[PDB]
Amino acid sequence: AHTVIIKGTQVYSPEKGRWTELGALDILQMLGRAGRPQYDTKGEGILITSHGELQYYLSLLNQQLPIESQMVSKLPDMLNAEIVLGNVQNAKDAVNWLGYAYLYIRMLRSPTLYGISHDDLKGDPLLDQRRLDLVHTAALMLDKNNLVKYDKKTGNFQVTELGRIASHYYITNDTVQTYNQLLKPTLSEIELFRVFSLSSEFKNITVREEEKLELQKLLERVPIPVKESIEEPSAKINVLLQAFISQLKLEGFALMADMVYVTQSAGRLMRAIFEIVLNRGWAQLTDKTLNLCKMIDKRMWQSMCPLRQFRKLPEEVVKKIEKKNFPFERLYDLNHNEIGELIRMPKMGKTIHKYVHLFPKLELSVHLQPITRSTLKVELTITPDFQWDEKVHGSSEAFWILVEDVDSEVILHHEYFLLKAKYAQDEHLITFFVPVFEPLPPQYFIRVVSDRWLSCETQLPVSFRHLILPEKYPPPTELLDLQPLPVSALRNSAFESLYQDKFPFFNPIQTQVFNTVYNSDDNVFVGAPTGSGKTICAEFAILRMLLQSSEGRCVYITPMEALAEQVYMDWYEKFQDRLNKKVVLLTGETSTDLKLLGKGNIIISTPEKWDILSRRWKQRKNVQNINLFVVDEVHLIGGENGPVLEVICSRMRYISSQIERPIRIVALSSSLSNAKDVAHWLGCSATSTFNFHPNVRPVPLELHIQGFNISHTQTRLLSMAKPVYHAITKHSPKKPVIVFVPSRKQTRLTAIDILTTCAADIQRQRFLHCTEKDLIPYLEKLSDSTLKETLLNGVGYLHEGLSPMERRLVEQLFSSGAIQVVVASRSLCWGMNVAAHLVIIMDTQYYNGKIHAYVDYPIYDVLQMVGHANRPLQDDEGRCVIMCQGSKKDFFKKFLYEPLPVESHLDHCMHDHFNAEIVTKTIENKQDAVDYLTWTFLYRRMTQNPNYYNLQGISHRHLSDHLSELVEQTLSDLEQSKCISIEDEMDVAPLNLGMIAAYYYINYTTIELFSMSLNAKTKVRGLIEIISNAAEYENIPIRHHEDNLLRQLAQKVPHKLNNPKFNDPHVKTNLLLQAHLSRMQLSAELQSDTEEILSKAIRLIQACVDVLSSNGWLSPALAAMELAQMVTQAMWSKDSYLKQLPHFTSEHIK
């Protein structure tokens, strides 16, 4: 406008609790509208204010008002935010951060106005003492308020839970101190308002006499009683908050301003109080605080109708629903006409039904399995029972899952649950561990409440009336203080020739178990932590097997293929080079497996490699005639690929009971709480079961768990990069460091992030213990340019995409001590031939794209990662920093120090074993199936943890009925798939499908689909889809950013896919098989999965040929035979027969 008139220049600011002058920004913005740029050639700005305030306006609008930093008022808040974010760790970091603020610049230019004399500037030109004094003064305020743990000795700052809440919610230090002193678990709704009204944000809010009468009318109408008086500021704040929630109409301008200011800061203050209460575990206070946060944001009481959250509904209809005081859940079961008739609003009945179904409502299912006597595994399935709406719900719905005891006062397990819009109408699996006390409560409360939606909470009482908790595990075998065992304790001189230069004395675990393993012939169970030398006990058993007869046959079973490769190399140079003993490694080929087993004295193989040979142990004499069966990592039977190991171990015990010569089973594994079941299942006695504790390792393990309360995985992964560098500098500045990454892509980012944190400080290239002259020979053989850039700085990286030469070179550089930090992927924990002093486990979870959820890492993988931080002679102790989310912090603390409870999972994957046993004639009837199942670990674990296997008791009728039902269910699945034939409902026989399934080691489901999906007119075009749909490809890795790449490969393959879903592993396998057949370029991550698919592709092709051979289809058999040849040659059937030859491009074909 041409003329602008600012009348009064006085605004009642609720923050100061009085009428203050207009701000500079408001005056400048108001004065900027004087004079239109189009028609006005000269503006006119009138500023009517007080005579004493005329100078401020003249200087502000005349370029005479200096910009002075006001950071002194909120110095502690800014310092707390930097400390919480990790930007500043000690006093020096805070001083450096303070130097980049406007206060430091203003303090140097104008020290007099900042409280600094000219003498101080002369004695400190850089202004370092003033920054230290300001940081110390700010740190004292933060330390006095319990915001940060600051010690005056070293100046280091420790981030506390209150500081994170205060920095996250912008709450002042005084407000945090008030919330800590006044925040109690027994605070009611009335006290919650008083605590909020006592915050430091409303310290200037005063109760004026001009509005006392109006406050009295609000005090008699507020639903929440106030123990304070009307003349106290706390009552006015509590009354203002209650009036805003109740929608009471105010009259005073000052009262309205105070209510708006109180309501605006109430949202952040309420969230901070809820976070503090939620962190403390107060279930009763958390529900009230969470309800209060939603009530303030929603501007409605919790007793009001839930339809008030949807602003599109009429108020008269909402009031009519409120007048008819009926339960909110009652409208869910009513139809559109019933809802309209119940409220007497037939016209709005359809809208009410649409609004009722659009409200968040999740159906909770509880699957509780007691892992231990004090720890229970709760698998909560959340099913969204509401129609998703972007205009009402948005991109995602935030919910909180709170686990509480019977009293509903202590939060056993609280975690955030983000319900994304793309993942609506689907069950979400939430797995967590809740503690169980000696006083077993009748039930637990699982409250899934919305984080923003009021009256949206689902309560699921997890009753423990029929919960049979496992019996208290026996104490682990104590490490007797025997004298160290010298090499002379062994008998054979040649046996001591392979350990003379290694160590003069054995470890205490080896000395205690050496007498039972080397000087004994009974089954020995050695439960010791990863790194105590369990392989030496197996070698003692191998030496015992080699002492009785020079032609012995020791069998070493490793749950991981990499462990067998590491053991095969270790065994080859020790058992073959120095003892002249045939040590061989089992392959995936059974044709060469029989020759290797018959010609080798030590047979190292995986559970899958030995299962194929052991399935026909009746015919194969080499499998039965075994003098020793070593099972390393027996604790792996409670995880993936564990049912095969349990079946192999059970088969080995059953074979040893009928061969006229027992097979000495040496079961080595981690320290397990339920070691009696493993010893009982493996035939180990009470004195031969060496089940130790995790704290008995030769190298003491210092395990530190850092909780990250970040729900998002990307933010949590990025926020832990700073902590990884801080943990390395605090735990091992000059020691090897191993960092575990959740994926192959995170290793490169983590390696650069550590370098970036190291480059931020003056300690550049501090992770390279050697010089660049000696790194040229190793850096020139690497293919990854980024690895050389990180390797030159002293920080290595490891992932599945790296070639073996690069992985071997990286391990060699780290083993020799040239490098200090190695960033290894989560999948490389088993395959790592090196150990560091400090082990970093950051983001202990993986993004499983099959279910679109962040699945936590298994305990076995974490145990191996923790075991990697074990230096026997070079390090006196071992550090392990486990950076994980706060929800899983309790799970790691229980399963890390205490023995690991292992439970067999053969009940879900017993179909393959049952078919193999039926084909071998081991199980000829239903009674034999139950008898065969009694030799496995599942039967032994069913009597100790019946609740884990859906059992109701340990009695014979319950155990016999459960085993019969499991046998009758697995047998029914085999009969329905045409794998076996059941005659008279009791006797089972092997069918054609079962023989093929158990011959090539194929899943029963794959054979059922092959037999029902293979016709007489099948071709190679449809053959790939049938092969790609086999159950063996369901374990393919689906990760983030893997759907876009597959889509690009779906338009280039020679075969189209009908209805291709990017989340289905079968589709990726078909695309990968087509890509391998066309020899097209693929990413490193895609090629890693292609090799895994190609490993089992040959067996599936052979099964298809066998299935077609029995079906009498010549055409389908020929296509399968051509596919098998084409799969090995990476060539297509539609192309010429010359692409198989190496170095032949399309030019030769043309």
């Binding site: 002194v72 502690p76 409280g115 230290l132 110390h136 003064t137 700010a138």
Partner: peptide, 7 residues
Amino acid sequence: PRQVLDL
């Protein structure tokens, strides 16, 4: 050497 000042 640090001195607490009047914030």
